Amino acid sequence: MAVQISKKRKFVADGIFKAELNEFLTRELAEDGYSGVEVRVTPTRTEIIILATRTQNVLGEKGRRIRELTAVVQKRFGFPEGSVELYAEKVATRGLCAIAQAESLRYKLLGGLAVRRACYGVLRFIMESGAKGCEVVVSGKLRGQRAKSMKFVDGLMIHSGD
Amino acid sequence: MLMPKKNRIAIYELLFKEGVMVAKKDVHMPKHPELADKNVPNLHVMKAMQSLKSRGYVKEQFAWRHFYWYLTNEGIQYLRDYLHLPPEIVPATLRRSR
Amino acid sequence: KKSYTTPKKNKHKRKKVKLAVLKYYKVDENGKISRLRRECPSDECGAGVFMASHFDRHYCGKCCLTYCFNK
Amino acid sequence: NATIRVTNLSEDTRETDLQELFRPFGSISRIYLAKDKTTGQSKGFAFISFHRREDAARAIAGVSGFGYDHLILNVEW
Amino acid sequence: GGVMDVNTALQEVLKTALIHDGLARGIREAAKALDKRQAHLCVLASNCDEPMYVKLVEALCAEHQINLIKVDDNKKLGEWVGLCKIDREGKPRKVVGCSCVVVKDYGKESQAKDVIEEYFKCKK
Amino acid sequence: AIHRIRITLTSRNVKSLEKVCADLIRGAKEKNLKVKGPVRMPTKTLRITTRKTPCGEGSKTWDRFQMRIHKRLIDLHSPSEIVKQITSISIEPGVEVEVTIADA
Amino acid sequence: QQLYWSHPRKFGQGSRSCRVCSNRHGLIRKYGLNMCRQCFRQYAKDIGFIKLD
Numbered sequence: 001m002a003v004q005i006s007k008k009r010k011f012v013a014d015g016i017f018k019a020e021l022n023e024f025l026t027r028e029l030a031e032d033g034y035s036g037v038e039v040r041v042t043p044t045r046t047e048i049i050i051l052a053t054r055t056q057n058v059l060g061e062k063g064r065r066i067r068e069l070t071a072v073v074q075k076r077f078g079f080p081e082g083s084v085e086l087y088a089e090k091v092a093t094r095g096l097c098a099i100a101q102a103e104s105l106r107y108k109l110l111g112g113l114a115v116r117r118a119c120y121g122v123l124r125f126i127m128e129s130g131a132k133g134c135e136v137v138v139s140g141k142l143r144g145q146r147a148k149s150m151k152f153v154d155g156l157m158i159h160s161g162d
Numbered sequence: 163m164l165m166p167k168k169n170r171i172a173i174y175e176l177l178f179k180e181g182v183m184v185a186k187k188d189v190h191m192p193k194h195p196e197l198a199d200k201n202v203p204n205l206h207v208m209k210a211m212q213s214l215k216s217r218g219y220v221k222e223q224f225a226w227r228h229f230y231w232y233l234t235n236e237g238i239q240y241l242r243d244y245l246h247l248p249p250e251i252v253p254a255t256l257r258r259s260r
Numbered sequence: 261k262k263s264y265t266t267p268k269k270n271k272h273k274r275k276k277v278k279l280a281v282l283k284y285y286k287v288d289e290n291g292k293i294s295r296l297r298r299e300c301p302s303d304e305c306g307a308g309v310f311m312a313s314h315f316d317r318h319y320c321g322k323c324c325l326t327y328c329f330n331k
Numbered sequence: 332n333a334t335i336r337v338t339n340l341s342e343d344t345r346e347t348d349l350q351e352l353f354r355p356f357g358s359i360s361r362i363y364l365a366k367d368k369t370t371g372q373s374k375g376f377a378f379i380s381f382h383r384r385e386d387a388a389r390a391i392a393g394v395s396g397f398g399y400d401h402l403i404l405n406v407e408w
Numbered sequence: 409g410g411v412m413d414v415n416t417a418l419q420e421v422l423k424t425a426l427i428h429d430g431l432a433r434g435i436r437e438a439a440k441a442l443d444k445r446q447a448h449l450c451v452l453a454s455n456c457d458e459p460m461y462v463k464l465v466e467a468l469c470a471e472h473q474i475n476l477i478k479v480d481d482n483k484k485l486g487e488w489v490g491l492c493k494i495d496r497e498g499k500p501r502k503v504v505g506c507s508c509v510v511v512k513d514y515g516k517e518s519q520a521k522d523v524i525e526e527y528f529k530c531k532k
Numbered sequence: 533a534i535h536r537i538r539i540t541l542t543s544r545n546v547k548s549l550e551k552v553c554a555d556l557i558r559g560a561k562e563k564n565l566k567v568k569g570p571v572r573m574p575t576k577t578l579r580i581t582t583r584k585t586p587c588g589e590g591s592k593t594w595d596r597f598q599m600r601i602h603k604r605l606i607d608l609h610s611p612s613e614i615v616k617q618i619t620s621i622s623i624e625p626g627v628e629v630e631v632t633i634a635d636a
Numbered sequence: 637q638q639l640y641w642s643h644p645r646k647f648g649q650g651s652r653s654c655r656v657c658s659n660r661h662g663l664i665r666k667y668g669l670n671m672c673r674q675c676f677r678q679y680a681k682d683i684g685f686i687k688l689d
Contacts, residue, residue, distance in 0.1 A: 282436050282439065285439065285464055290466055290470060291466070291469075291470025291471055292467065292471075293467045293468060293471055306444060308440040309440065
């Protein structure tokens with residue numbers, strides 16, 4: 001159980017764990033209203049706070065899904081056994097959570113629905129929830145086999161500076 | 163073969179115990195370290211899970227050169243009878259998550 | 261990239277001839293069992309399998325790199 | 332059910348008291364106790380973000396109890 | 409299970425013997441099993457094959473371990489085996505006669521398995 | 533006994549770093565552990581200078597990325613118990629700490 | 637079957653592989669990369685970096 005890697009390499013390996021997880025989860029919790037994570041190592045314990053809007057579908061009946069997820073991480077990155085501990089979290093104010101708003105629009109569209117009325121419906125929600133402004137783009141095909149672009153915009157926006 | 167009859171058991175029994183399997187995408191793995199201990203010199207995990215997946219009984223994710231196979235209820239019934247196990251045993255997990 | 265051009269041979273895998281099975285034990289009177297050629301002597305061999313009667317070559321088929329007498 | 336609602340709480344009930352009387356009974360995510368304005372005392376309503384539904388479904392009348400001033404708490408959805 | 413009748417007795421073998429992995433099906437595997445001391449039981453069945461094995465099996469039982477049983481109608485024991493394990497002994501996908509089976513310590517040694525063989529051995 | 537115990541901090545965020553150092557210097561000086569101040573070490577540059585264009589075409593452009601790490605360490609000399617007690621608690625941000633038995 | 641399937645890969649551009657899918661061509665090692673320059677860009681937002689210059 002030693003020694004330990006250089007301080008320069010210490011941050012890179014943390015970043016790789018922070019990033020890989022964040023795309024692992026997005027391919028499973030897409031329908032559950034995923035919105036991110038926030039990792040924290042704590043004394044002799046890992047915390048992985050799995051942020052999603054509806055904790056219901058994440059939990060499952062008898063906590064099956066959360067049990068699957070913990071057993072995965074325990075084998076995959078070769079964690080010492082029983083150190084890993086998951087936690088869930090529900091976010092309040094869901095219209096500032098761009099990641100979830102975009103991935104909700106996805107399943108509305110892929111569910112089979114018109115584009116204009118869908119874009120309007122998501123727009124007023126993120127405006128209502130609080131926001132100076134907001135924007136939506138849909139670039140690709142529709143009504144033939146040449147591509148187009150469709151912008152739906154309301155309020156303020158910024159594009160330059162820090 | 164396709165693979166021995168010993169090495170089938172060692173995958174199907176190991177899956178039943180953790181409730182989940184994971185592996186990497188390679189074809190030059192020499193003995194497959196990182197469990198199944200030193201008796202899979204080839205694909206075998208990936209090749210046997212895929213056939214199992216064809217007939218349902220499991221789900222499969224894939225992300226950054228790593229598989230993730232999630233056992234399901236239907237496969238628990240199958241594996242329970244297939245390996246001649248008690249009518250109510252799940253050693254993978256069974257408790258309420260708080 | 262482009263399609264394969266004609267060969268004038270190809271043959272895949274031999275059919276591993278469909279020989280009659282177990283005549284390796286000979287019975288002329290009972291309870292006697294008349295064994296022919298010696299049963300394989302290695303520790304890792306079980307010595308319940310026969311060795312090849314392959315004269316001018318004498319070879320255990322359970323072995324696959326070792327134990328080839330020839331006389 | 333949007334909030335796990337608890338009533339009939341004594342004035343000895345605090346966020347940490349409920350955290351205790353819930354944690355070995357299924358780990359919670361957060362208590363929201365009506366602490367009186369400018370007073371740590373309770374008011375009688377508590378919203379318990381238990382973060383779970385399974386372990387709570389597994390027992391309904393044990394957590395209501397376990398020993399508290401010879402009183403019993405409410406579990407409600 | 410059984411009452412120590414010959415027919416229900418050989419069925420009781422196959423159930424726990426499967427778990428013990430004692431089944432040496434086919435004449436070649438039966439021979440290697442009984443030429444070894446791993447075997448403890450031999451069962452034969454009606455001729456569907458050559459008149460050589462019927463002689464030879466008695467000859468092997470003589471020298472090494474006497475234990476033989478003969479029960480006719482190959483299709484009975486042929487039906488009792490699966491294609492892997494339990495899940496259909498009916499099964500028009502494949503069913504075929506064993507014609508001989510050899511079992512190692514007659515499978516698990518437990519209940520009625522012990523009694524069926526001990527009943528036969530003292531009278532034979 | 534009283535051992536020279538070194539509390540090393542390391543971070544990438546100057547706010548998150550510095551206030552957590554301050555907390556440990558107050559709590560130490562409060563208990564008169566004869567604490568020695570922060571020794572701020574040179575901030576190090578990870579540089580990555582790579583193409584901005586996949587499948588190079590068009591005007592040749594690049595992109596400078598940088599990460600700035602920070603190190604600084606406070607040296608204490610006091611019993612190892614009360615140090616290892618108080619150190620690991622009272623840390624809000626994602627900032628690392630490494631305790632050393634002795635160095636001097 | 638076969639008695640070979642492989643031949644020495646111990647150094648060179650074929651014995652290291654990059655993490656896109658086992659992609660290459662795009663020789664990479666830096667500071668412990670093993671990470672593909674096209675995707676490195678997409679992880680500018682993700683942690684490891686935030687652009688500041």
